Symmetry: none
Subunit: 496 residues, 2 copies
Amino acid sequence: IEYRGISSNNRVTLDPLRLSNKELRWLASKKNLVIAVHKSQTATLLHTDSQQRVRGINADYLNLLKRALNIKLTLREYADHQKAMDALAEGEVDIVLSHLVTSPPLNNDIAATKPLIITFPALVTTLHDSMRPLTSPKPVNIARVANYPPDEVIHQSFPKATIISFTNLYQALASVSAGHNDYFIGSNIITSSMISRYFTHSLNVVKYYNSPRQYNFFLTRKESVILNEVLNRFVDALTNEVRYEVSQNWLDTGNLAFLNKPLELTEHEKQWIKQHPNLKVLENPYSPPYSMTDENGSVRGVMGDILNIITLQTGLNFSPITVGWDIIPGAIYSEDRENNVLFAEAFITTPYVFVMQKAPDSEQTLKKGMKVAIPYYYELHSQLKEMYPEVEWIQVDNASAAFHKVKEGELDALVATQLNSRYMIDHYYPNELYHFLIPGVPNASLSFAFPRGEPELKDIINKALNAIPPSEVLRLTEKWIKMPNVTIDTWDLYSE
Amino acid sequence: IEYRGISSNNRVTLDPLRLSNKELRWLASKKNLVIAVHKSQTATLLHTDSQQRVRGINADYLNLLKRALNIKLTLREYADHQKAMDALAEGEVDIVLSHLVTSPPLNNDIAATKPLIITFPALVTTLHDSMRPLTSPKPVNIARVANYPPDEVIHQSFPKATIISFTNLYQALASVSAGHNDYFIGSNIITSSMISRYFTHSLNVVKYYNSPRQYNFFLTRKESVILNEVLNRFVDALTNEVRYEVSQNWLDTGNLAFLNKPLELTEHEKQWIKQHPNLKVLENPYSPPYSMTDENGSVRGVMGDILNIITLQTGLNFSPITVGWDIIPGAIYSEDRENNVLFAEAFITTPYVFVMQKAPDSEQTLKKGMKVAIPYYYELHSQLKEMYPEVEWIQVDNASAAFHKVKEGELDALVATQLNSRYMIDHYYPNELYHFLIPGVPNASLSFAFPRGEPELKDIINKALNAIPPSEVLRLTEKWIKMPNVTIDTWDLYSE
């Protein structure tokens, strides 16, 4: 009905599958497999090159399936989905690779493997409206493709929403890019895909949702018992590490493949998540790009986005609270404060810097009789007091508000972390301040903190943190250093 | 109780044995040796094939023994190990080839040769967790086979470790690959051989230990004075060169047979090793894949692993906490730097490359007005300004952070090492950067460096490096090019 080839780099490789000898003999005389595919509406899942070969994320997985089983593939695209299923029932094809669906088919003449592709819904807005709250009780125009996701899930975040269903993904994203619709919500695997290709200058993702996910499946006849158990053996070998590398070939931002598969949790940790589904997040002082809050008091910044990722990884949900709390979104490890809280393993390391006025006569040094501010929760005060007994050291309640005091010349310097200084300078005092490293001081190690009788939440977050690729933490830090603001807070910038 | 033959690929031929005339008459009159063997649980040491012939690592050595002594060999498998030892008492067998043991049996009848197979403990983890520290006071789950190594050894590295003891090596390694257990530790010649077979893309060795080693022996009755001496003649002729080629056929990675036997060290050198322990290693800038420091401050990367190997070769003892220094782990040779340090002989050469952004209109030369960064400790600034005097050449303190500046368009190019650029691009900026060779410059030559007054250490490292096969260095760089970090450091990756 159609014939093709596969076009893919074999950069991703799989361990050998453990197949029975009855399965190994079945594959050898089967020799070849006919799979019914189809071009996706967007190019991400499956497209064709000039040599009439197939390409995309689905092609990369098919390439792995071809090698993991040591069997030949024949790719056909039928006119519709129904003629493909007719060929499956007739025996013209062995497998049908389904389009993106919300659930597998239940008719028992069909057998479905475990899901191949697993993707999540994403909230998309303009780059200059990203810092606005991700929920609203006010009227709002929300775009979507077809009926994904349904009305009621959109209404949990925007109860007064007017939903506009588009035929096409590009058209729906462009309507937000122009300004007709305030948000778009849709499948992330294809939304992140196209934003980087067409709307990179104008749109970005601000939130992932845990449900309702979309999948595609391999589909066989119910009679093809051995084929389905072999296909399932191949899909189980597709770990978060394997899925991440496959999707790296086609996604820049929005690669959530590292959390397609669950984490290795004890049955006690799984019961604990089950009995504590919604935890409270203590509010941090303003410390961009790590911990920031929007007008609704919800955690944004890198720590806020990591919390979004942890939700998809673990199922835990987090709600705002202000200064019965359960998690601190971003904290500096210290020996003293460990007697007050419990620390997760560090996932960001950063150096301490001195922030000073950028003038012609600037020297990268402290001087006798300078006024240098340092936040009280950095217990560097004792060590700098001995390195610089010459300096008048001023403990401060509000770290971010001390930048302005340096800009006005009241303070000679201020102690901060590298990227916290870069944000404050670029966003609020460009070309007015600079920084340099503090010599002879250990690095800061950022992570989450908890109440101290919470071993389960600590051990669970540690597993989730260890599962996040470091390049995703780097992309998130790039994202939030460049993120435009919509408000200024007088207290975070001018207190005292 | 069960009888076989010998299968092997005679790729290794041994030098003729210096045998006494009295011994050749004994071998001529004996004419045949009854040797009790046993099938290892893995195929690496001993298995059988189609014709019921012995095959494996033990088989290749038995083949060499048959040709070294020019005698016939009958191999028998008794029920358990105690029945083979019983048969050796009554004289029914001449030799018993032992299983892997940490010691030869105490029995004061039983004579053991020098060790035949020599193997070391190995710590194993998943590839994506390999940058976690090799020791930790934190709770961990360690998998092992039976009771090797003992708990007191495992607790030296992990005092709060839960040790799960498996009966079967495959299941133990599978538990680490699936994420249930954090590490595995066990006999290397068995562990790495099975990783080559089934876990090549999910498990790898991260550390070899000096002790407790494991061996197998030729066990005879002490009555056999002539048999024992002829057996020791054979075992003494198994040089590093011979053992490495025998293990080559069954181990693709982690083949430590090149350090089974001691190096040809002088008396003075051996005394220097034993009388200068806890040698101090200088910390290098973040320089992947050659050098980088984990969350413990320990040296990792290719240079870090080669130090671990050098320790197993020579007994050199390096401090795990880096810095009054005794060795620079990896350094580019320079004739003018030789006034400050001594260099070992180079064992890796690599060219310099320009890093630029991957655009459609990219073309592989510089232009004038371009801002190109070069590390200040590279001594190419002299020559590069004369070849490209129309270019603005900027010295930088942080080579790894300059990659980001090129990505952002603030720099036009960056001077780097081929594999240094390959790592940064592969892991942090894929499809956003590329590189091409710098024309008309020599290659950088990598080796260890030492203070001026340490000739003995430099002479030892030279002998050790010469004994490391280049394929193992190639094996190590493959591993570290593909290996990501476990955390990000903002100073390593974010510019100024």
